[PDB]
Design a protein around this nucleic acid. Structure first.
Lengths: 151, 198, 47
DNA sequence: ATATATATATATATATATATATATATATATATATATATATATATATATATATATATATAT
DNA sequence: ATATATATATATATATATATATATATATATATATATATATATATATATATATATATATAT
């Protein structure tokens, strides 16, 4: 019932907004406010990259441990198979692994990542973007979606 | 942009010489001081009354007498704690008012640095990406000055929530997966934590 | 929570001795190196 | 005419030497933190003088 | 009874001295960075030996 009431109040909100929009009274984000508003958007994204960089090290060390253990003579074939499977299951369950797995699940649901990239492209085109950030940051943010795929 | 490059080394030369946090990270005795200060302010947010702060500090320093590799007070730990509080007030790490001491924003940044260093719960989390997705959606719908764009956005969103209402009236609503809620909530905490520092 | 307090100074002792970033911030020549490195990687993202 | 062996020319790989650059180790100069000493500042001990309120005697 | 002068007692302020703590300045020890020197590694110069494909002469 809480979700029901939430949905009801929200549909009332968007119904009011639709009544306004059909009359043509919609309002834009105040141009100056859009500057810091877009800059906040950029500030959020910066974290994702700097922790995928940490995911890199996590997986590197997991793989190196797997190798150094494979030298172990006493490891039966089953033992090495079990070590690979367990070292990857556990690795995927650390916060690094959770971030990586969620991003991977976005890939299956690709349309959302594509929509995010499209919206980003539309965002940085607006004149406000020029004031908000230097061209370097516009270049980075637009291709953040691809950059996650690369990393 | 190269002008910023030339001017920037002035900024970093100044900070390395002047700003409190960087000087603290530089000093030989940085880790002990940072750990003690974090311990003090961690367990209370109102600003410690000075007597309580110095007593707790003299208690903490006693634990680190086992850490013989850095200064150990041989005879009077309370004097040592008082001296260290004086010193850290001198370095603008802690400013005290009304007898209640507080951790300067410089020390806040300093501690926020070393916290993010070690193998940790990283600043980001899984829900961060969905957060930015929703935020980009909202901001794009806002900046869009074309009214028909807002009309279509409202129509699609109302259709989404109308489908969800049809489901909810049938009772099929779904909760956030309990494990996913953990880092989802940790994300929300991480977001707001910045407000305090600024 | 006090156990975390006792164990924590080990974490910061190790990092101040071991982790790259903190060691860099510590060294005397840190600002020049940091400015130059920022300049390099700033203008391109592909490596 | 085809197949096998020798001489030729070309291409390549290799050997040795020279110079250049990198890396490792030692010594040096320098900056940082600590500690020592002096002086100064804060508090408290001890006692005196001063200041205030009161009562008592005197003058109207 | 009012109003002024004196003595009394109580309270507070002040003065000087002792001790304790803080702060400032100087000296010393230690850590960090740089530089010097040695040796080793990488490349390239010079030339030689070897390897491969070809062509020519001989045998079937």
């Amino acid at each position: 019932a809480n979700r029901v009431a939430t949905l009801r109040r929200r549909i009332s909100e968007l119904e009011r907004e639709l009544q306004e929009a059909e009359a043509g009274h919609i309002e834009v984000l105040e141009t100056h406010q859009a500057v810091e508003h877009i800059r906040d958007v950029y500030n959020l994204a910066s974290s994702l990259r700097a922790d995928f960089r940490r995911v890199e090290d996590s997986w590197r060390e997991a793989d190196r441990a797997l190798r150094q253990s494979i030298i172990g003579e006493q490891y039966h074939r089953g033992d090495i198979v079990e070590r690979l499977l367990n070292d990857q299951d556990a690795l995927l369950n650390t916060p690094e692994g959770r971030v990586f797995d969620s991003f991977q699940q976005q890939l299956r649901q690709s349309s959302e990542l594509k929509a995010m990239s499209e919206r980003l492209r539309v965002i940085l085109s607006h004149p406000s973007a020029s004031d908000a950030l230097n061209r370097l940051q516009r270049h980075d943010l637009r291709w953040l979606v691809k950059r996650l795929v690369d990393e | 942009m190269e002008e910023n490059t030339r001017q920037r080394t002035e900024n970093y030369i100044s900070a390395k010489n002047q700003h409190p946090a960087w000087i603290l990270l530089a000093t030989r005795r940085a880790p002990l001081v940072l750990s003690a200060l974090k311990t003090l302010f961690e367990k209370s947010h109102d600003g410690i009354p000075l007597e309580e702060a110095i007593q707790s500090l003299s208690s903490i320093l006693i634990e680190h007498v086992s850490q013989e590799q850095y200064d150990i007070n041989q005879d009077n730990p309370f004097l040592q704690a008082s001296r260290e509080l004086r010193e850290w007030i001198k370095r603008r790490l802690i400013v005290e008012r009304d007898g209640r001491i507080f951790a300067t924003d410089a020390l806040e940044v300093a501690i926020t640095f070393v916290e993010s260093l070690d193998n940790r719960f990283m600043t980001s989390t899984a829900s961060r990406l969905s957060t930015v997705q929703r935020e980009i959606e909202n901001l794009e719908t806002r900046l869009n000055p074309n009214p028909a764009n807002r009309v279509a956005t409202l129509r699609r969103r109302i259709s989404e929530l109308e489908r969800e209402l049809q489901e909810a009236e049938a009772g099929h609503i779904e909760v956030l997966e309990t494990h996913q809620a953990v880092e989802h909530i940790r994300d929300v905490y991480n977001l707001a934590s910045s407000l305090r520092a600024d």
